[PDB]
Amino acid sequence: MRQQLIRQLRTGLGAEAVNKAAEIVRAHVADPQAQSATVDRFLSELEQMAPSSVTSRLRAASRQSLAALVEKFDSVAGGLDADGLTNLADELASVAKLLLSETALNKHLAEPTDDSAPKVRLLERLLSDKVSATTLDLLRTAVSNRWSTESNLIDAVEHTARLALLKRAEIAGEVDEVEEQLFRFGRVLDAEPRLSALLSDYTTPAEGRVALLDKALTGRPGVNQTAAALLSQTVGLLRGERADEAVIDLAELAVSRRGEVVAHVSAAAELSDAQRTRLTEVLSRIYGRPVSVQLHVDPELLGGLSITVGDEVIDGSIASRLAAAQTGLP
Amino acid sequence: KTAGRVVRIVVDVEFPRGSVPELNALHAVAQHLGDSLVRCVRGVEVTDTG
Amino acid sequence: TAGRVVRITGPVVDVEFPRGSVPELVAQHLGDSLVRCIGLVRGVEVTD
Amino acid sequence: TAGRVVRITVVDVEFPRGSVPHLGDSLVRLVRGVEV
Amino acid sequence: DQQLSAQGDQVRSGLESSVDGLSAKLASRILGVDVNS
Amino acid sequence: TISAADIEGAIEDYVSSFEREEIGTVIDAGDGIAHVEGLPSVMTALNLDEHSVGAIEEGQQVKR
Amino acid sequence: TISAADIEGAIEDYVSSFSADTEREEIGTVIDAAHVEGLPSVMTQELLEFPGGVLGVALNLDEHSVGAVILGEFEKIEEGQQVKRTGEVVNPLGQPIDGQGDIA
Amino acid sequence: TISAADIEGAIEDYVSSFSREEIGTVIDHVEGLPSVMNLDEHSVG
């Protein structure tokens, strides 16, 4: 019974002490100098941290076929001009919506078969002249391979379209602009679930949803044209994915094309340019391959950073330290 | 807002992401089925006490 | 040419192999290059 | 206007829309494809 | 237990004085740089 | 991408395209029951449907 | 007699020993309830930590998710929570329930 | 560049753009009848 009382004393003292510590932390970190110092200390820890040695949904057939199709696009899209790329993307999106609309045609174009000649003949007879030669070649390559499910087919086509647009963005040299715009649109779509839900409903006609997107946040004066086109094309062909998740996938793919990895860094406040460069360098060193850092701002962190790449998270948030202290009591 | 709507009728109720009631009383929660659905006229608004 | 564990349901283990390397009866061929063989981690290499 | 066998389990036959003599999608519950 | 309860009520008041030091040290630890407060 | 009713003819052409022998492919096989994709002309192979034929190693060629 | 010296020391040592160093960690998300997406390297029968100190064990593993059996206070589990992997395979956990104290 | 109110203009404009008696069709189960009193998002038992 004595030790029972002692334990009650321990829990009470710990709870009050940790509450006082939390108040002290909150008071001390309100100063922006405190925020910057916390971020700098966490970055130091990050340099001290050891490096990490280490389209998933696609199965074997779909994944291999998509690899073949992306290789084919890389081959064909070598010297195509920017206007040609805008075209090619347009025809690819049109064909994707065609396949989606014509369920029977997609079905017949889906089943794997040892001989690809009948499928190629079918495509040529269908749209030999309705689209340019490069589109014909890409679609022929896409149908030649096998797909685990018919859906993957259209996915592959859609992928190519996105790639094409990204390519012209690269030709424009504004890859950074389009990536930033795509991430911002993903943020606002996630923040406004109603807009995503109204856009993420294929049942309604696609033209109306595209017009809604254009008028709401995509026809704005200060929006990169390539990003707007990519987002409108994505929503137009949308199959049932959440619009915000679709935009996040677009941004992730855009960064992937540059060979980098997206790192979602959550901070209490915005970071300095020097801090941003240091963070990018340390994250690249830890993960090896270069990483592009996207800043979320959340006051509840109280300081530090909460980085996350892939399925891995480095939680330096001060609030996390406070929670650990709360749960670490005897 | 943050009010769900009946989807299937045991009644399945679909809530906005980030507003799913905890495993709660609703007015027109047994399981979280994912995609912000929970299991407890289709489309009637549903509110959570919290 | 070596498979990788895809599902671990107690003793049952679904393993995925490359296209032309599926082992022969591995208690069952689930199709799509998967087989259902009878502290494991998904993705660990499996050798035929 | 003539149906065709799709599954032979019981036989399922698909018919042109508006010609269904009923599993939906115009199906109704030997070589597959023979016209009915 | 009444003697024990009285001891508890006395010691909790006695130790309330030192909570400032413990909380300050804990904040010092979970900030990396010591906080004087 | 205007698509007229040519599709309906085209599919028919495709449907007719598939003198050469009809070879199926085992898609899965367990518990003594196999499924074969292909063999569009196979006679009633217990269960037949638009996907496969319910009659060994995956990928084997199956004679009609 | 309950000397306040030990009373204060039992917390002073903990405070002086608290060091929650940021550890590079692999997480997942509860998709329904619990099934957890992510945790690619989770071992079969691994111990998982859900928010609120809840504990689960990973039994069913597949390409989509991880089925985890919660070892108590399942009512605290919500879709979207973050699940951490402990990396390792009196109540059955060894925690005393009588209340007589701790155990070595 | 984001107002968060022009979004409202667009969304309610579209909702108004949508706006008759509701008629269901037999699928095998009735599709449609969104306001009908075994109900699920696909069809009606």
Side-chain angles (χ1 to χ4, degrees), chain A residues 30-63:
Chain A
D31 191 325
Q33 277 72 341
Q35 306 264 10
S36 168
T38 42
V39 170
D40 301 324
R41 286 195 295 286
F42 179 63
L43 289 148
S44 304
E45 298 204 330
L46 271 171
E47 290 89 5
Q48 302 318 318
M49 185 179 288
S52 178
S53 45
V54 185
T55 71
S56 61
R57 60 185 60 74
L58 304 167
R59 318 205 67 71
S62 306
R63 188 191 336 139

mmCIF file of all heavy atoms in Angstrom, chain A residues 30-63:
data_model
loop_
_atom_site.group_PDB
_atom_site.id
_atom_site.type_symbol
_atom_site.label_atom_id
_atom_site.label_comp_id
_atom_site.label_asym_id
_atom_site.label_seq_id
_atom_site.Cartn_x
_atom_site.Cartn_y
_atom_site.Cartn_z
ATOM 1 N N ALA A 30 8.370 30.142 -29.333
ATOM 2 C CA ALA A 30 7.653 31.169 -30.081
ATOM 3 C C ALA A 30 8.615 32.114 -30.785
ATOM 4 O O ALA A 30 8.298 32.642 -31.856
ATOM 5 C CB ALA A 30 6.730 31.950 -29.148
ATOM 6 N N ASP A 31 9.786 32.337 -30.208
ATOM 7 C CA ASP A 31 10.772 33.199 -30.840
ATOM 8 C C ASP A 31 11.272 32.550 -32.128
ATOM 9 O O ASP A 31 11.709 31.394 -32.101
ATOM 10 C CB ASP A 31 11.936 33.453 -29.886
ATOM 11 C CG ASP A 31 12.867 34.544 -30.375
ATOM 12 O OD1 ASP A 31 13.073 34.651 -31.601
ATOM 13 O OD2 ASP A 31 13.391 35.298 -29.529
ATOM 14 N N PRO A 32 11.235 33.248 -33.267
ATOM 15 C CA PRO A 32 11.736 32.630 -34.505
ATOM 16 C C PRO A 32 13.189 32.204 -34.414
ATOM 17 O O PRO A 32 13.589 31.242 -35.082
ATOM 18 C CB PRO A 32 11.529 33.726 -35.560
ATOM 19 C CG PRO A 32 11.341 34.986 -34.795
ATOM 20 C CD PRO A 32 10.711 34.603 -33.505
ATOM 21 N N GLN A 33 13.997 32.893 -33.607
ATOM 22 C CA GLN A 33 15.361 32.430 -33.385
ATOM 23 C C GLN A 33 15.361 31.024 -32.807
ATOM 24 O O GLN A 33 16.181 30.185 -33.193
ATOM 25 C CB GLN A 33 16.100 33.391 -32.455
ATOM 26 C CG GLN A 33 16.687 34.604 -33.153
ATOM 27 C CD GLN A 33 15.627 35.594 -33.589
ATOM 28 O OE1 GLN A 33 14.449 35.254 -33.691
ATOM 29 N NE2 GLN A 33 16.040 36.828 -33.845
ATOM 30 N N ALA A 34 14.440 30.746 -31.883
ATOM 31 C CA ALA A 34 14.336 29.403 -31.324
ATOM 32 C C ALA A 34 13.973 28.384 -32.396
ATOM 33 O O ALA A 34 14.535 27.285 -32.433
ATOM 34 C CB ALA A 34 13.303 29.386 -30.199
ATOM 35 N N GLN A 35 13.028 28.727 -33.272
ATOM 36 C CA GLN A 35 12.656 27.813 -34.347
ATOM 37 C C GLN A 35 13.858 27.500 -35.225
ATOM 38 O O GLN A 35 14.140 26.332 -35.528
ATOM 39 C CB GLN A 35 11.534 28.424 -35.187
ATOM 40 C CG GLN A 35 10.304 28.853 -34.410
ATOM 41 C CD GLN A 35 9.214 27.806 -34.414
ATOM 42 O OE1 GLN A 35 9.427 26.672 -34.839
ATOM 43 N NE2 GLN A 35 8.028 28.187 -33.960
ATOM 44 N N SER A 36 14.580 28.538 -35.645
ATOM 45 C CA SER A 36 15.733 28.324 -36.509
ATOM 46 C C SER A 36 16.796 27.494 -35.804
ATOM 47 O O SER A 36 17.423 26.626 -36.419
ATOM 48 C CB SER A 36 16.311 29.663 -36.955
ATOM 49 O OG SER A 36 17.582 29.486 -37.554
ATOM 50 N N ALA A 37 17.024 27.756 -34.517
ATOM 51 C CA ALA A 37 18.020 26.989 -33.780
ATOM 52 C C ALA A 37 17.624 25.522 -33.690
ATOM 53 O O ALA A 37 18.470 24.632 -33.845
ATOM 54 C CB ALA A 37 18.206 27.582 -32.386
ATOM 55 N N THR A 38 16.346 25.247 -33.426
ATOM 56 C CA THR A 38 15.892 23.862 -33.373
ATOM 57 C C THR A 38 16.101 23.177 -34.714
ATOM 58 O O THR A 38 16.576 22.036 -34.773
ATOM 59 C CB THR A 38 14.418 23.802 -32.978
ATOM 60 O OG1 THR A 38 13.694 24.820 -33.676
ATOM 61 C CG2 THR A 38 14.259 24.004 -31.485
ATOM 62 N N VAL A 39 15.754 23.861 -35.803
ATOM 63 C CA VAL A 39 15.939 23.269 -37.122
ATOM 64 C C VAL A 39 17.415 23.002 -37.381
ATOM 65 O O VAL A 39 17.783 21.966 -37.943
ATOM 66 C CB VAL A 39 15.327 24.173 -38.206
ATOM 67 C CG1 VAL A 39 15.725 23.683 -39.584
ATOM 68 C CG2 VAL A 39 13.820 24.211 -38.068
ATOM 69 N N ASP A 40 18.283 23.933 -36.984
ATOM 70 C CA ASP A 40 19.714 23.748 -37.204
ATOM 71 C C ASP A 40 20.243 22.558 -36.415
ATOM 72 O O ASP A 40 21.048 21.771 -36.925
ATOM 73 C CB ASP A 40 20.469 25.018 -36.821
ATOM 74 C CG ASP A 40 20.019 26.222 -37.616
ATOM 75 O OD1 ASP A 40 19.696 26.059 -38.810
ATOM 76 O OD2 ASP A 40 19.986 27.331 -37.046
ATOM 77 N N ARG A 41 19.810 22.418 -35.164
ATOM 78 C CA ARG A 41 20.243 21.278 -34.367
ATOM 79 C C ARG A 41 19.767 19.970 -34.981
ATOM 80 O O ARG A 41 20.518 18.987 -35.038
ATOM 81 C CB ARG A 41 19.731 21.420 -32.935
ATOM 82 C CG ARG A 41 20.475 22.459 -32.122
ATOM 83 C CD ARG A 41 20.187 22.310 -30.643
ATOM 84 N NE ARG A 41 18.790 22.588 -30.331
ATOM 85 C CZ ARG A 41 18.253 23.799 -30.322
ATOM 86 N NH1 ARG A 41 18.963 24.874 -30.618
ATOM 87 N NH2 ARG A 41 16.968 23.936 -30.008
ATOM 88 N N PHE A 42 18.517 19.934 -35.448
ATOM 89 C CA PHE A 42 18.023 18.715 -36.074
ATOM 90 C C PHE A 42 18.793 18.407 -37.349
ATOM 91 O O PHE A 42 19.085 17.243 -37.642
ATOM 92 C CB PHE A 42 16.534 18.827 -36.378
ATOM 93 C CG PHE A 42 15.978 17.610 -37.043
ATOM 94 C CD1 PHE A 42 15.984 16.392 -36.393
ATOM 95 C CD2 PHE A 42 15.484 17.673 -38.328
ATOM 96 C CE1 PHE A 42 15.487 15.265 -37.006
ATOM 97 C CE2 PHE A 42 14.986 16.550 -38.943
ATOM 98 C CZ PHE A 42 14.987 15.344 -38.283
ATOM 99 N N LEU A 43 19.127 19.434 -38.127
ATOM 100 C CA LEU A 43 19.925 19.202 -39.323
ATOM 101 C C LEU A 43 21.288 18.636 -38.959
ATOM 102 O O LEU A 43 21.788 17.726 -39.630
ATOM 103 C CB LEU A 43 20.068 20.498 -40.116
ATOM 104 C CG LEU A 43 18.777 20.954 -40.798
ATOM 105 C CD1 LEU A 43 18.710 22.465 -40.887
ATOM 106 C CD2 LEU A 43 18.664 20.332 -42.176
ATOM 107 N N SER A 44 21.903 19.164 -37.898
ATOM 108 C CA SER A 44 23.163 18.609 -37.412
ATOM 109 C C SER A 44 23.012 17.128 -37.097
ATOM 110 O O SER A 44 23.815 16.295 -37.536
ATOM 111 C CB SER A 44 23.624 19.379 -36.178
ATOM 112 O OG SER A 44 23.737 20.762 -36.458
ATOM 113 N N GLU A 45 21.968 16.781 -36.343
ATOM 114 C CA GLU A 45 21.677 15.374 -36.095
ATOM 115 C C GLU A 45 21.588 14.605 -37.403
ATOM 116 O O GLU A 45 22.054 13.464 -37.500
ATOM 117 C CB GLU A 45 20.369 15.231 -35.316
ATOM 118 C CG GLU A 45 20.382 15.875 -33.947
ATOM 119 C CD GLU A 45 19.374 15.249 -33.007
ATOM 120 O OE1 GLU A 45 18.328 14.768 -33.490
ATOM 121 O OE2 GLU A 45 19.625 15.238 -31.785
ATOM 122 N N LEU A 46 20.989 15.219 -38.423
ATOM 123 C CA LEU A 46 20.818 14.532 -39.697
ATOM 124 C C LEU A 46 22.160 14.234 -40.354
ATOM 125 O O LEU A 46 22.372 13.126 -40.859
ATOM 126 C CB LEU A 46 19.931 15.356 -40.625
ATOM 127 C CG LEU A 46 18.431 15.076 -40.510
ATOM 128 C CD1 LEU A 46 17.638 16.097 -41.301
ATOM 129 C CD2 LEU A 46 18.101 13.671 -40.976
ATOM 130 N N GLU A 47 23.085 15.200 -40.360
ATOM 131 C CA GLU A 47 24.417 14.867 -40.868
ATOM 132 C C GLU A 47 25.031 13.744 -40.050
ATOM 133 O O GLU A 47 25.665 12.838 -40.605
ATOM 134 C CB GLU A 47 25.394 16.051 -40.891
ATOM 135 C CG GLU A 47 25.127 17.153 -41.908
ATOM 136 C CD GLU A 47 24.222 18.231 -41.405
ATOM 137 O OE1 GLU A 47 23.869 18.178 -40.223
ATOM 138 O OE2 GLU A 47 23.874 19.138 -42.188
ATOM 139 N N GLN A 48 24.857 13.779 -38.730
ATOM 140 C CA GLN A 48 25.388 12.698 -37.911
ATOM 141 C C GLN A 48 24.702 11.368 -38.197
ATOM 142 O O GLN A 48 25.232 10.321 -37.816
ATOM 143 C CB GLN A 48 25.250 13.042 -36.429
ATOM 144 C CG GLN A 48 25.945 14.332 -36.017
ATOM 145 C CD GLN A 48 27.311 14.492 -36.651
ATOM 146 O OE1 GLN A 48 28.085 13.541 -36.731
ATOM 147 N NE2 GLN A 48 27.611 15.701 -37.111
ATOM 148 N N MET A 49 23.549 11.384 -38.859
ATOM 149 C CA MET A 49 22.791 10.163 -39.086
ATOM 150 C C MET A 49 23.427 9.331 -40.190
ATOM 151 O O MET A 49 23.913 9.863 -41.190
ATOM 152 C CB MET A 49 21.344 10.496 -39.444
ATOM 153 C CG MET A 49 20.450 9.279 -39.578
ATOM 154 S SD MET A 49 18.753 9.713 -39.986
ATOM 155 C CE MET A 49 18.212 10.411 -38.430
ATOM 156 N N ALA A 50 23.413 8.014 -40.000
ATOM 157 C CA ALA A 50 24.030 7.115 -40.958
ATOM 158 C C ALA A 50 23.194 7.030 -42.233
ATOM 159 O O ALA A 50 21.977 7.234 -42.202
ATOM 160 C CB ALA A 50 24.188 5.723 -40.357
ATOM 161 N N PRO A 51 23.819 6.727 -43.367
ATOM 162 C CA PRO A 51 23.058 6.581 -44.611
ATOM 163 C C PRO A 51 22.200 5.326 -44.598
ATOM 164 O O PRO A 51 22.464 4.361 -43.880
ATOM 165 C CB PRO A 51 24.144 6.500 -45.686
ATOM 166 C CG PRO A 51 25.332 5.981 -44.976
ATOM 167 C CD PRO A 51 25.259 6.513 -43.576
ATOM 168 N N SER A 52 21.152 5.355 -45.416
ATOM 169 C CA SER A 52 20.208 4.252 -45.525
ATOM 170 C C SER A 52 20.588 3.388 -46.718
ATOM 171 O O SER A 52 20.619 3.871 -47.855
ATOM 172 C CB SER A 52 18.779 4.766 -45.677
ATOM 173 O OG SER A 52 17.870 3.690 -45.822
ATOM 174 N N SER A 53 20.870 2.111 -46.457
ATOM 175 C CA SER A 53 21.250 1.202 -47.533
ATOM 176 C C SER A 53 20.106 1.003 -48.519
ATOM 177 O O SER A 53 20.318 1.005 -49.737
ATOM 178 C CB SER A 53 21.690 -0.139 -46.948
ATOM 179 O OG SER A 53 20.798 -0.563 -45.932
ATOM 180 N N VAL A 54 18.889 0.831 -48.014
ATOM 181 C CA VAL A 54 17.742 0.542 -48.864
ATOM 182 C C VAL A 54 17.529 1.676 -49.858
ATOM 183 O O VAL A 54 18.042 1.638 -50.977
ATOM 184 C CB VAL A 54 16.474 0.308 -48.023
ATOM 185 C CG1 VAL A 54 15.310 -0.102 -48.916
ATOM 186 C CG2 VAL A 54 16.731 -0.744 -46.955
ATOM 187 N N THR A 55 4.970 2.738 -59.275
ATOM 188 C CA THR A 55 3.795 2.026 -59.763
ATOM 189 C C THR A 55 3.759 0.619 -59.181
ATOM 190 O O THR A 55 3.679 -0.369 -59.911
ATOM 191 C CB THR A 55 3.778 1.948 -61.303
ATOM 192 O OG1 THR A 55 4.800 1.052 -61.756
ATOM 193 C CG2 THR A 55 4.010 3.325 -61.909
ATOM 194 N N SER A 56 3.818 0.542 -57.852
ATOM 195 C CA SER A 56 3.864 -0.754 -57.185
ATOM 196 C C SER A 56 2.631 -1.591 -57.489
ATOM 197 O O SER A 56 2.710 -2.823 -57.514
ATOM 198 C CB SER A 56 4.003 -0.556 -55.677
ATOM 199 O OG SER A 56 2.900 0.163 -55.155
ATOM 200 N N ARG A 57 1.485 -0.947 -57.718
ATOM 201 C CA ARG A 57 0.247 -1.694 -57.918
ATOM 202 C C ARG A 57 0.345 -2.641 -59.106
ATOM 203 O O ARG A 57 -0.284 -3.705 -59.103
ATOM 204 C CB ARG A 57 -0.920 -0.727 -58.110
ATOM 205 C CG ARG A 57 -0.762 0.208 -59.297
ATOM 206 C CD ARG A 57 -1.893 1.220 -59.365
ATOM 207 N NE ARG A 57 -1.958 2.046 -58.165
ATOM 208 C CZ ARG A 57 -1.106 3.021 -57.878
ATOM 209 N NH1 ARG A 57 -0.104 3.327 -58.688
ATOM 210 N NH2 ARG A 57 -1.260 3.704 -56.747
ATOM 211 N N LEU A 58 1.120 -2.280 -60.122
ATOM 212 C CA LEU A 58 1.233 -3.123 -61.303
ATOM 213 C C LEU A 58 1.843 -4.471 -60.941
ATOM 214 O O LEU A 58 2.831 -4.550 -60.207
ATOM 215 C CB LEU A 58 2.085 -2.430 -62.363
ATOM 216 C CG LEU A 58 1.604 -1.045 -62.791
ATOM 217 C CD1 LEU A 58 2.674 -0.330 -63.591
ATOM 218 C CD2 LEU A 58 0.324 -1.158 -63.594
ATOM 219 N N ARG A 59 1.248 -5.537 -61.466
ATOM 220 C CA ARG A 59 1.769 -6.882 -61.274
ATOM 221 C C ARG A 59 2.876 -7.137 -62.297
ATOM 222 O O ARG A 59 3.366 -6.218 -62.956
ATOM 223 C CB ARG A 59 0.640 -7.902 -61.374
ATOM 224 C CG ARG A 59 -0.623 -7.470 -60.657
ATOM 225 C CD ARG A 59 -1.461 -8.664 -60.240
ATOM 226 N NE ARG A 59 -0.807 -9.457 -59.207
ATOM 227 C CZ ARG A 59 -0.654 -9.071 -57.948
ATOM 228 N NH1 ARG A 59 -1.096 -7.899 -57.525
ATOM 229 N NH2 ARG A 59 -0.039 -9.881 -57.092
ATOM 230 N N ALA A 60 3.289 -8.398 -62.435
ATOM 231 C CA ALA A 60 4.429 -8.710 -63.294
ATOM 232 C C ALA A 60 4.153 -8.327 -64.741
ATOM 233 O O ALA A 60 4.932 -7.594 -65.363
ATOM 234 C CB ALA A 60 4.767 -10.196 -63.192
ATOM 235 N N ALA A 61 3.038 -8.806 -65.292
ATOM 236 C CA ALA A 61 2.743 -8.561 -66.699
ATOM 237 C C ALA A 61 2.533 -7.078 -66.960
ATOM 238 O O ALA A 61 3.125 -6.506 -67.884
ATOM 239 C CB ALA A 61 1.511 -9.362 -67.119
ATOM 240 N N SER A 62 1.695 -6.433 -66.149
ATOM 241 C CA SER A 62 1.434 -5.014 -66.342
ATOM 242 C C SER A 62 2.704 -4.196 -66.168
ATOM 243 O O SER A 62 2.968 -3.271 -66.943
ATOM 244 C CB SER A 62 0.358 -4.546 -65.367
ATOM 245 O OG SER A 62 -0.804 -5.346 -65.476
ATOM 246 N N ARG A 63 3.504 -4.521 -65.154
ATOM 247 C CA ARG A 63 4.716 -3.751 -64.894
ATOM 248 C C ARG A 63 5.702 -3.882 -66.047
ATOM 249 O O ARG A 63 6.270 -2.886 -66.510
ATOM 250 C CB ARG A 63 5.347 -4.217 -63.585
ATOM 251 C CG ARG A 63 6.500 -3.360 -63.102
ATOM 252 C CD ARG A 63 7.236 -4.040 -61.962
ATOM 253 N NE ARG A 63 6.383 -4.991 -61.257
ATOM 254 C CZ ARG A 63 6.769 -6.186 -60.828
ATOM 255 N NH1 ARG A 63 8.009 -6.618 -60.997
ATOM 256 N NH2 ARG A 63 5.889 -6.969 -60.213
#
